[PDB]
Amino acid sequence: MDWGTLQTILGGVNKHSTSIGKIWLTVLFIFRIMILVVAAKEVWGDEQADFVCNTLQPGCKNVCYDHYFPISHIRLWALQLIFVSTPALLVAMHVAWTYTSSIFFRVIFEAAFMYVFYVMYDGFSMQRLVKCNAWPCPNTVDCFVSRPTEKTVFTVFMIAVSGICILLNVTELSYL
Amino acid sequence: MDWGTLQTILGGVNKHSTSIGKIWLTVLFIFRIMILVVAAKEVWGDEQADFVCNTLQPGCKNVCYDHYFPISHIRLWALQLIFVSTPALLVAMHVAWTYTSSIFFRVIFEAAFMYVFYVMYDGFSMQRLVKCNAWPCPNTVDCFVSRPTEKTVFTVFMIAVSGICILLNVTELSYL
DSSP states (O other), X not given: OOOOOOOOOOOOOOOSSOOHHHHHHHHHHHHHHHHHHHTGGXXXXXXXXXXXXXXXXXXXXHHHHHHHOSSOHHHHHHHXXXXXXXXXXXXXXXXXXXXXXXXXXXXXXXHHHHHHHXXXXXXXXXXXXXXXXXXXXXXXXXXXXXXXXXXXXXXHHHHHHHHHHHHHHHXXXXXX | OOOOOOOOOOOOXXXXXXXXXXXXXXXXXXXXXXXXXXXXXXXXXXXXXXOOEESOOTTHHHHHHHHHOSSOHHHHHHHHHHHTTHHHHHHTSOOOOOHHHHHHHHHHHHHHHHHHHHHHSTTSOXXXXXXXXXXXXXXXXXXXXXXXXXXHHHHHHHHHHHHHHHHHHXXXXXXX
């Protein structure tokens, strides 16, 4: 891939005691894109052949995999970014009803993804072994995970990023 | 094999209103020997490669096999017969402290094997699937059996035989 190949005329800088946010926020935008693609198919890209189930039950790997991973972290992120992406191309150029409502959209989205995330991954963690007692899964069986530490780390990162994103997003939203 | 090849001089028969038992009891003795050897290594002779455990746990077949089959039925029988065998060669010829105590021994042994049996195989049955949650057996796993019906049948037989053995054994023990 390659994303962004024309940014040369940016001599105009800020002078006020504000609009520091847009710097921080474009930086976090670009950042999160890199951070994503660089580790995109490279942490969670694997986790299909990595959910070993101690059994001889047919299918129970698939069963428990959806049971505990309806969706992977990186998708909720990918979405979180895209919904939080549309205000970016908006704020690309501003001076001359929406504009600040773009800022607010950007806030509330990111908030939503945080909440529903912690609803799903309660404990902000990756259990080393998830058991499973699904229908075909004849009793409570065991179902492993690879690299739970890893995924936990990058999750801590992205959530911290979400917090700072919103804090400057809102710190300039709160101009009154 | 071949067991018993000299029995010709038995013209002397009983005339009293008793000693019918010794007929019945020698018949049951010979019977149970045949009944055994004919189906000896031929119902329970197999059951080593016949205890399938749905798992990928190493050893868990052996583990659960001993767990649920410390010993097979046919051994408890084999013993039951042998302990109940010694009074037979005694009562081979009788007329002329032990003699009736042989009869009583024969009773109480067979009783013991009945009790301890039902202690172990509670329900007078063969479960089609025994689960298992042993140490190495990581969770409650499944562990199959072959021919549980079969073994149940022949068990019903041998226990009925035990009952009749004792009933005539004792009916002549109860002479007063």
